[PDB]
């Protein structure tokens, strides 16, 4: 069985320009567990990103939280790139602070 | 991490005997009782994975609060005389054995007839046979060297429905005599000394 | 077949090497070695699974083991010491990580300082007393085994060519013929009791048999006496 | 409140590249408290909550030895299942295992679990009576006959009804300041034009613990399913959770709609209106 | 606390 990741991109706390925060990319519902997830700042990959320990839901599908400390600015763009065997091309999901 | 009572527990035939074994690590959660006859291999008697387990005349019980394991033997038979090993499983793969509890089931001698008899060599020598005494009689070793006395031993004529205690004494001394062989033991006052 | 082990008994001198062999239960892939001593009880040495060493107890450098493609195992002990005297138990289990370990019958190893003092037993049978027959209508035969060393002996009673267990008691431990001396030889007694009428039938034959385990025929013997090899010593009596 | 302890194990083969990757995680409720990673440097069970760090070295030594034995058994399992399914020796495959227990508000045993999946498909599962098995296909039937003959369910039940709830209750007390806490949702509603005549109302719940929550939309007092959307509850990364629910409404009618949030931390369900 | 007892598929 394979399943396609769901992807949400969001800050840990309400985004305030100039105030330190955490940028999160949450992938869930996917199988097998092999997956690439990167945080992007203006299209460039962020180097120091952490992630939670591999875990799974009651239906055996996996979920992971990727995250990194960041200070949002009015001008800086942020996004999450996800690649997985179920995806024919990589999914990029932009962070939308006013959702 | 496994400490049990060494014994020997002397149990009247048909009685109930119980002993404890304690474990040190509160995370331990798998235990067993093993039986081992002298110089033979340890054999699983019963497992205990939860609060307890009852298998027939045997009953084991894990007091997870007290951190000890118990075994209970109801209507003790002479065949229950053995060493009982308290056994802990760790990590899923490793057994840790306690030093063992020895239990000796004593026969209920209905008609004790304590006597000391002289047996002679089949092919020429003699030996003293203290026999038919109640299981409360203790046979001691002799202070004198060159005087050999064995422990009490229970035999069982199954077909005759008869059990008997005996001990054997022998020496190579001229001054050795069956009337004097067991003088270091408290023997029944009505012991038969046939001339 | 269950768990089997060879040899059953080994008598050796300090400084020698020995090999213990174990064939696990058919279908079992794990084999375990255990050591049972008087001073520390049953202790886990080492486990193999499908040819690979997998868990290790407090096994000494001079101990080494192996599981072969046919899954039998070999335990090799070198530079033997007095302290290595022990019961060595093989065990097997189906799975890698299991508490369901089935034990073999054991190999008994005795390490002596030298073999100067190994001795087979002398075995003698003693007929019932007339006093006991007339007093109890029962008849007790006593078998003595004397002057053996070490104490690897098995005593058995045989009536009319068939081994008996009813009405027999053998001492559980040999006694020291000289308790003050270490290396003292041992004695062992057994009784067999029958009805007076069964002893009185002259067609009944009684034999006390002592299997003694000692030196192998391929052991060096410098002493001035017959070589104390693994042998049976017996004594007999007929009914009367 | 009722409570749960869960252990989750993933083993992924990588033939030619060493032993399988093995990750074990332990949870109380929605709080992770331990992990092990076969590829990490420590080679130890590691604490992931503050209240588990108070356990001494005996606890950590013992959980490390157990979790490493778990990894070795599930490494053998990958090999076994490969044979069961007559699969090539080359490919990567995944064995997952979960076990744990639920307790009620009196912290007494409610139910236990012990179940496996292979390549994301159900393989074998202990049934709710803790005495029988659900085998998902014919390889798993082989396991089930073996486990029935070895009376595996009986030994699992001793853990699930006993040890598992005893240690769950230990963690609930030692960790009471965080495990027995409820963080109430912080709530607000956002609004977006979505067409020339429609708008999206989004009802937000932020910073709540535990993860269980209910977000509902009503129109003129009636619960509304048409044109609503629920996002999966997600971790904030600080131990609390986040969730939103949105509905598309005719523009000019925003004020006939209300969002309704229920959560254990709320003394009374909240009602939000645009 | 982990379960110690392990059984192979």
PDB file of N, CA and C in Angstrom, chain C residues 106-179:
ATOM      1  N   UNK C 106      23.088 -31.912  30.374  1.00  0.00           N
ATOM      2  CA  UNK C 106      24.284 -31.433  31.045  1.00  0.00           C
ATOM      3  C   UNK C 106      25.495 -32.301  30.762  1.00  0.00           C
ATOM      4  N   UNK C 107      26.661 -31.664  30.766  1.00  0.00           N
ATOM      5  CA  UNK C 107      27.950 -32.349  30.834  1.00  0.00           C
ATOM      6  C   UNK C 107      28.585 -31.979  32.166  1.00  0.00           C
ATOM      7  N   UNK C 108      28.930 -32.970  32.983  1.00  0.00           N
ATOM      8  CA  UNK C 108      29.622 -32.667  34.229  1.00  0.00           C
ATOM      9  C   UNK C 108      31.124 -32.646  33.997  1.00  0.00           C
ATOM     10  N   UNK C 109      31.761 -31.541  34.355  1.00  0.00           N
ATOM     11  CA  UNK C 109      33.208 -31.405  34.238  1.00  0.00           C
ATOM     12  C   UNK C 109      33.837 -31.300  35.624  1.00  0.00           C
ATOM     13  N   UNK C 110      34.811 -32.158  35.895  1.00  0.00           N
ATOM     14  CA  UNK C 110      35.622 -32.060  37.100  1.00  0.00           C
ATOM     15  C   UNK C 110      37.057 -31.826  36.653  1.00  0.00           C
ATOM     16  N   UNK C 111      37.651 -30.737  37.120  1.00  0.00           N
ATOM     17  CA  UNK C 111      39.052 -30.413  36.897  1.00  0.00           C
ATOM     18  C   UNK C 111      39.798 -30.700  38.194  1.00  0.00           C
ATOM     19  N   UNK C 112      40.715 -31.661  38.170  1.00  0.00           N
ATOM     20  CA  UNK C 112      41.553 -31.996  39.321  1.00  0.00           C
ATOM     21  C   UNK C 112      42.964 -31.446  39.131  1.00  0.00           C
ATOM     22  N   UNK C 113      43.690 -31.268  40.247  1.00  0.00           N
ATOM     23  CA  UNK C 113      45.077 -30.809  40.152  1.00  0.00           C
ATOM     24  C   UNK C 113      45.932 -31.788  39.352  1.00  0.00           C
ATOM     25  N   UNK C 114      45.777 -33.080  39.604  1.00  0.00           N
ATOM     26  CA  UNK C 114      46.348 -34.112  38.755  1.00  0.00           C
ATOM     27  C   UNK C 114      45.385 -35.286  38.787  1.00  0.00           C
ATOM     28  N   UNK C 115      45.698 -36.335  38.038  1.00  0.00           N
ATOM     29  CA  UNK C 115      44.852 -37.516  38.041  1.00  0.00           C
ATOM     30  C   UNK C 115      45.380 -38.591  38.972  1.00  0.00           C
ATOM     31  N   UNK C 116      46.326 -38.243  39.853  1.00  0.00           N
ATOM     32  CA  UNK C 116      46.965 -39.218  40.740  1.00  0.00           C
ATOM     33  C   UNK C 116      45.954 -40.001  41.564  1.00  0.00           C
ATOM     34  N   UNK C 117      44.808 -39.389  41.866  1.00  0.00           N
ATOM     35  CA  UNK C 117      43.889 -39.877  42.882  1.00  0.00           C
ATOM     36  C   UNK C 117      42.553 -40.350  42.315  1.00  0.00           C
ATOM     37  N   UNK C 118      42.433 -40.491  40.996  1.00  0.00           N
ATOM     38  CA  UNK C 118      41.237 -41.097  40.424  1.00  0.00           C
ATOM     39  C   UNK C 118      41.219 -42.592  40.737  1.00  0.00           C
ATOM     40  N   UNK C 119      40.039 -43.113  41.099  1.00  0.00           N
ATOM     41  CA  UNK C 119      39.882 -44.497  41.564  1.00  0.00           C
ATOM     42  C   UNK C 119      38.495 -44.994  41.181  1.00  0.00           C
ATOM     43  N   UNK C 120      38.370 -46.188  40.618  1.00  0.00           N
ATOM     44  CA  UNK C 120      37.044 -46.786  40.453  1.00  0.00           C
ATOM     45  C   UNK C 120      36.508 -47.244  41.797  1.00  0.00           C
ATOM     46  N   UNK C 121      35.215 -47.545  41.892  1.00  0.00           N
ATOM     47  CA  UNK C 121      34.647 -48.038  43.151  1.00  0.00           C
ATOM     48  C   UNK C 121      34.813 -49.541  43.327  1.00  0.00           C
ATOM     49  N   UNK C 122      34.764 -49.963  44.590  1.00  0.00           N
ATOM     50  CA  UNK C 122      34.517 -51.350  44.955  1.00  0.00           C
ATOM     51  C   UNK C 122      33.055 -51.462  45.368  1.00  0.00           C
ATOM     52  N   UNK C 123      32.377 -52.517  44.918  1.00  0.00           N
ATOM     53  CA  UNK C 123      30.934 -52.639  45.109  1.00  0.00           C
ATOM     54  C   UNK C 123      30.636 -53.976  45.764  1.00  0.00           C
ATOM     55  N   UNK C 124      29.839 -53.945  46.834  1.00  0.00           N
ATOM     56  CA  UNK C 124      29.524 -55.127  47.618  1.00  0.00           C
ATOM     57  C   UNK C 124      28.051 -55.083  48.009  1.00  0.00           C
ATOM     58  N   UNK C 125      27.397 -56.241  47.983  1.00  0.00           N
ATOM     59  CA  UNK C 125      25.983 -56.355  48.314  1.00  0.00           C
ATOM     60  C   UNK C 125      25.874 -57.085  49.638  1.00  0.00           C
ATOM     61  N   UNK C 126      24.933 -56.653  50.463  1.00  0.00           N
ATOM     62  CA  UNK C 126      24.738 -57.213  51.787  1.00  0.00           C
ATOM     63  C   UNK C 126      23.325 -57.768  51.891  1.00  0.00           C
ATOM     64  N   UNK C 127      23.229 -59.028  52.296  1.00  0.00           N
ATOM     65  CA  UNK C 127      21.958 -59.723  52.341  1.00  0.00           C
ATOM     66  C   UNK C 127      21.174 -59.338  53.590  1.00  0.00           C
ATOM     67  N   UNK C 128      19.848 -59.442  53.531  1.00  0.00           N
ATOM     68  CA  UNK C 128      19.020 -59.115  54.698  1.00  0.00           C
ATOM     69  C   UNK C 128      19.405 -59.933  55.918  1.00  0.00           C
ATOM     70  N   UNK C 129      19.086 -59.385  57.085  1.00  0.00           N
ATOM     71  CA  UNK C 129      19.241 -60.127  58.324  1.00  0.00           C
ATOM     72  C   UNK C 129      18.042 -61.038  58.545  1.00  0.00           C
ATOM     73  N   UNK C 130      18.308 -62.206  59.126  1.00  0.00           N
ATOM     74  CA  UNK C 130      17.207 -63.050  59.568  1.00  0.00           C
ATOM     75  C   UNK C 130      16.341 -62.314  60.580  1.00  0.00           C
ATOM     76  N   UNK C 131      16.953 -61.444  61.393  1.00  0.00           N
ATOM     77  CA  UNK C 131      16.198 -60.687  62.390  1.00  0.00           C
ATOM     78  C   UNK C 131      15.118 -59.824  61.741  1.00  0.00           C
ATOM     79  N   UNK C 132      15.437 -59.153  60.624  1.00  0.00           N
ATOM     80  CA  UNK C 132      14.462 -58.264  59.987  1.00  0.00           C
ATOM     81  C   UNK C 132      13.339 -59.042  59.302  1.00  0.00           C
ATOM     82  N   UNK C 133      13.654 -60.180  58.674  1.00  0.00           N
ATOM     83  CA  UNK C 133      12.611 -60.956  58.002  1.00  0.00           C
ATOM     84  C   UNK C 133      11.599 -61.469  59.016  1.00  0.00           C
ATOM     85  N   UNK C 134      12.089 -62.026  60.124  1.00  0.00           N
ATOM     86  CA  UNK C 134      11.193 -62.574  61.133  1.00  0.00           C
ATOM     87  C   UNK C 134      10.441 -61.484  61.884  1.00  0.00           C
ATOM     88  N   UNK C 135      10.931 -60.249  61.853  1.00  0.00           N
ATOM     89  CA  UNK C 135      10.275 -59.168  62.569  1.00  0.00           C
ATOM     90  C   UNK C 135       9.349 -58.341  61.691  1.00  0.00           C
ATOM     91  N   UNK C 136       9.613 -58.252  60.381  1.00  0.00           N
ATOM     92  CA  UNK C 136       8.850 -57.359  59.512  1.00  0.00           C
ATOM     93  C   UNK C 136       8.281 -58.012  58.256  1.00  0.00           C
ATOM     94  N   UNK C 137       8.553 -59.294  58.005  1.00  0.00           N
ATOM     95  CA  UNK C 137       8.192 -59.951  56.738  1.00  0.00           C
ATOM     96  C   UNK C 137       8.688 -59.166  55.524  1.00  0.00           C
ATOM     97  N   UNK C 138       9.731 -58.360  55.711  1.00  0.00           N
ATOM     98  CA  UNK C 138      10.401 -57.646  54.637  1.00  0.00           C
ATOM     99  C   UNK C 138      11.891 -57.938  54.733  1.00  0.00           C
ATOM    100  N   UNK C 139      12.592 -57.671  53.637  1.00  0.00           N
ATOM    101  CA  UNK C 139      13.993 -58.047  53.469  1.00  0.00           C
ATOM    102  C   UNK C 139      14.725 -56.918  52.757  1.00  0.00           C
ATOM    103  N   UNK C 140      15.726 -56.323  53.413  1.00  0.00           N
ATOM    104  CA  UNK C 140      16.436 -55.164  52.868  1.00  0.00           C
ATOM    105  C   UNK C 140      17.860 -55.547  52.473  1.00  0.00           C
ATOM    106  N   UNK C 141      18.191 -55.370  51.194  1.00  0.00           N
ATOM    107  CA  UNK C 141      19.561 -55.512  50.720  1.00  0.00           C
ATOM    108  C   UNK C 141      20.235 -54.152  50.705  1.00  0.00           C
ATOM    109  N   UNK C 142      21.505 -54.107  51.106  1.00  0.00           N
ATOM    110  CA  UNK C 142      22.274 -52.867  51.105  1.00  0.00           C
ATOM    111  C   UNK C 142      23.468 -53.032  50.174  1.00  0.00           C
ATOM    112  N   UNK C 143      23.624 -52.089  49.255  1.00  0.00           N
ATOM    113  CA  UNK C 143      24.768 -52.031  48.359  1.00  0.00           C
ATOM    114  C   UNK C 143      25.698 -50.908  48.794  1.00  0.00           C
ATOM    115  N   UNK C 144      26.972 -51.236  49.005  1.00  0.00           N
ATOM    116  CA  UNK C 144      28.008 -50.256  49.309  1.00  0.00           C
ATOM    117  C   UNK C 144      28.915 -50.044  48.105  1.00  0.00           C
ATOM    118  N   UNK C 145      29.197 -48.780  47.792  1.00  0.00           N
ATOM    119  CA  UNK C 145      30.239 -48.418  46.840  1.00  0.00           C
ATOM    120  C   UNK C 145      31.293 -47.616  47.589  1.00  0.00           C
ATOM    121  N   UNK C 146      32.541 -48.088  47.578  1.00  0.00           N
ATOM    122  CA  UNK C 146      33.569 -47.497  48.423  1.00  0.00           C
ATOM    123  C   UNK C 146      34.836 -47.185  47.637  1.00  0.00           C
ATOM    124  N   UNK C 147      35.565 -46.192  48.133  1.00  0.00           N
ATOM    125  CA  UNK C 147      36.871 -45.850  47.614  1.00  0.00           C
ATOM    126  C   UNK C 147      36.918 -45.335  46.192  1.00  0.00           C
ATOM    127  N   UNK C 148      35.915 -44.580  45.756  1.00  0.00           N
ATOM    128  CA  UNK C 148      35.982 -44.021  44.414  1.00  0.00           C
ATOM    129  C   UNK C 148      36.294 -42.532  44.477  1.00  0.00           C
ATOM    130  N   UNK C 149      36.812 -42.015  43.366  1.00  0.00           N
ATOM    131  CA  UNK C 149      37.189 -40.614  43.227  1.00  0.00           C
ATOM    132  C   UNK C 149      37.419 -40.287  41.755  1.00  0.00           C
ATOM    133  N   UNK C 150      36.808 -39.212  41.229  1.00  0.00           N
ATOM    134  CA  UNK C 150      35.826 -38.297  41.861  1.00  0.00           C
ATOM    135  C   UNK C 150      34.469 -38.962  42.054  1.00  0.00           C
ATOM    136  N   UNK C 151      33.405 -38.201  42.313  1.00  0.00           N
ATOM    137  CA  UNK C 151      32.119 -38.821  42.628  1.00  0.00           C
ATOM    138  C   UNK C 151      31.176 -38.877  41.428  1.00  0.00           C
ATOM    139  N   UNK C 152      31.668 -39.128  40.215  1.00  0.00           N
ATOM    140  CA  UNK C 152      30.787 -39.347  39.063  1.00  0.00           C
ATOM    141  C   UNK C 152      30.393 -40.826  39.020  1.00  0.00           C
ATOM    142  N   UNK C 153      29.394 -41.206  39.826  1.00  0.00           N
ATOM    143  CA  UNK C 153      28.901 -42.581  39.835  1.00  0.00           C
ATOM    144  C   UNK C 153      27.387 -42.605  39.679  1.00  0.00           C
ATOM    145  N   UNK C 154      26.878 -43.690  39.089  1.00  0.00           N
ATOM    146  CA  UNK C 154      25.440 -43.944  39.022  1.00  0.00           C
ATOM    147  C   UNK C 154      25.190 -45.369  39.481  1.00  0.00           C
ATOM    148  N   UNK C 155      24.436 -45.504  40.564  1.00  0.00           N
ATOM    149  CA  UNK C 155      24.102 -46.790  41.148  1.00  0.00           C
ATOM    150  C   UNK C 155      22.715 -47.206  40.679  1.00  0.00           C
ATOM    151  N   UNK C 156      22.551 -48.485  40.352  1.00  0.00           N
ATOM    152  CA  UNK C 156      21.237 -48.974  39.957  1.00  0.00           C
ATOM    153  C   UNK C 156      21.074 -50.409  40.425  1.00  0.00           C
ATOM    154  N   UNK C 157      19.831 -50.777  40.718  1.00  0.00           N
ATOM    155  CA  UNK C 157      19.505 -52.146  41.103  1.00  0.00           C
ATOM    156  C   UNK C 157      18.842 -52.883  39.951  1.00  0.00           C
ATOM    157  N   UNK C 158      19.190 -54.158  39.818  1.00  0.00           N
ATOM    158  CA  UNK C 158      18.732 -55.012  38.733  1.00  0.00           C
ATOM    159  C   UNK C 158      18.258 -56.317  39.343  1.00  0.00           C
ATOM    160  N   UNK C 159      16.976 -56.625  39.188  1.00  0.00           N
ATOM    161  CA  UNK C 159      16.431 -57.897  39.643  1.00  0.00           C
ATOM    162  C   UNK C 159      16.030 -58.708  38.418  1.00  0.00           C
ATOM    163  N   UNK C 160      16.439 -59.979  38.397  1.00  0.00           N
ATOM    164  CA  UNK C 160      16.156 -60.887  37.286  1.00  0.00           C
ATOM    165  C   UNK C 160      16.437 -60.228  35.937  1.00  0.00           C
ATOM    166  N   UNK C 161      17.505 -59.433  35.882  1.00  0.00           N
ATOM    167  CA  UNK C 161      17.911 -58.792  34.647  1.00  0.00           C
ATOM    168  C   UNK C 161      17.159 -57.533  34.278  1.00  0.00           C
ATOM    169  N   UNK C 162      16.262 -57.043  35.137  1.00  0.00           N
ATOM    170  CA  UNK C 162      15.446 -55.870  34.837  1.00  0.00           C
ATOM    171  C   UNK C 162      15.675 -54.808  35.901  1.00  0.00           C
ATOM    172  N   UNK C 163      15.868 -53.567  35.468  1.00  0.00           N
ATOM    173  CA  UNK C 163      16.192 -52.509  36.410  1.00  0.00           C
ATOM    174  C   UNK C 163      14.964 -52.122  37.226  1.00  0.00           C
ATOM    175  N   UNK C 164      15.157 -51.959  38.529  1.00  0.00           N
ATOM    176  CA  UNK C 164      14.050 -51.713  39.441  1.00  0.00           C
ATOM    177  C   UNK C 164      14.193 -50.330  40.052  1.00  0.00           C
ATOM    178  N   UNK C 165      13.046 -49.715  40.332  1.00  0.00           N
ATOM    179  CA  UNK C 165      12.991 -48.460  41.068  1.00  0.00           C
ATOM    180  C   UNK C 165      12.084 -48.513  42.285  1.00  0.00           C
ATOM    181  N   UNK C 166      11.111 -49.423  42.329  1.00  0.00           N
ATOM    182  CA  UNK C 166      10.273 -49.580  43.508  1.00  0.00           C
ATOM    183  C   UNK C 166      11.072 -50.199  44.649  1.00  0.00           C
ATOM    184  N   UNK C 167      10.898 -49.644  45.844  1.00  0.00           N
ATOM    185  CA  UNK C 167      11.542 -50.200  47.013  1.00  0.00           C
ATOM    186  C   UNK C 167      13.033 -49.975  47.102  1.00  0.00           C
ATOM    187  N   UNK C 168      13.568 -48.951  46.438  1.00  0.00           N
ATOM    188  CA  UNK C 168      14.992 -48.648  46.538  1.00  0.00           C
ATOM    189  C   UNK C 168      15.168 -47.205  46.996  1.00  0.00           C
ATOM    190  N   UNK C 169      16.189 -46.989  47.824  1.00  0.00           N
ATOM    191  CA  UNK C 169      16.655 -45.660  48.195  1.00  0.00           C
ATOM    192  C   UNK C 169      18.174 -45.628  48.121  1.00  0.00           C
ATOM    193  N   UNK C 170      18.715 -44.710  47.318  1.00  0.00           N
ATOM    194  CA  UNK C 170      20.145 -44.445  47.211  1.00  0.00           C
ATOM    195  C   UNK C 170      20.466 -43.106  47.866  1.00  0.00           C
ATOM    196  N   UNK C 171      21.583 -43.035  48.594  1.00  0.00           N
ATOM    197  CA  UNK C 171      21.949 -41.766  49.210  1.00  0.00           C
ATOM    198  C   UNK C 171      22.081 -40.698  48.126  1.00  0.00           C
ATOM    199  N   UNK C 172      21.614 -39.470  48.379  1.00  0.00           N
ATOM    200  CA  UNK C 172      21.740 -38.429  47.348  1.00  0.00           C
ATOM    201  C   UNK C 172      23.170 -37.955  47.151  1.00  0.00           C
ATOM    202  N   UNK C 173      23.992 -37.984  48.196  1.00  0.00           N
ATOM    203  CA  UNK C 173      25.358 -37.518  48.062  1.00  0.00           C
ATOM    204  C   UNK C 173      26.324 -38.571  48.584  1.00  0.00           C
ATOM    205  N   UNK C 174      27.467 -38.754  47.929  1.00  0.00           N
ATOM    206  CA  UNK C 174      28.511 -39.608  48.510  1.00  0.00           C
ATOM    207  C   UNK C 174      29.035 -38.990  49.794  1.00  0.00           C
ATOM    208  N   UNK C 175      29.505 -39.827  50.708  1.00  0.00           N
ATOM    209  CA  UNK C 175      30.207 -39.295  51.867  1.00  0.00           C
ATOM    210  C   UNK C 175      31.716 -39.419  51.663  1.00  0.00           C
ATOM    211  N   UNK C 176      32.467 -38.527  52.310  1.00  0.00           N
ATOM    212  CA  UNK C 176      33.926 -38.575  52.265  1.00  0.00           C
ATOM    213  C   UNK C 176      34.417 -39.677  53.194  1.00  0.00           C
ATOM    214  N   UNK C 177      35.212 -40.604  52.657  1.00  0.00           N
ATOM    215  CA  UNK C 177      35.804 -41.629  53.510  1.00  0.00           C
ATOM    216  C   UNK C 177      36.800 -41.039  54.496  1.00  0.00           C
ATOM    217  N   UNK C 178      37.320 -39.844  54.215  1.00  0.00           N
ATOM    218  CA  UNK C 178      38.230 -39.132  55.112  1.00  0.00           C
ATOM    219  C   UNK C 178      37.913 -37.645  55.016  1.00  0.00           C
ATOM    220  N   UNK C 179      36.951 -37.155  55.805  1.00  0.00           N
ATOM    221  CA  UNK C 179      36.506 -35.759  55.624  1.00  0.00           C
ATOM    222  C   UNK C 179      37.603 -34.737  55.838  1.00  0.00           C
TER     223      UNK C 179
END
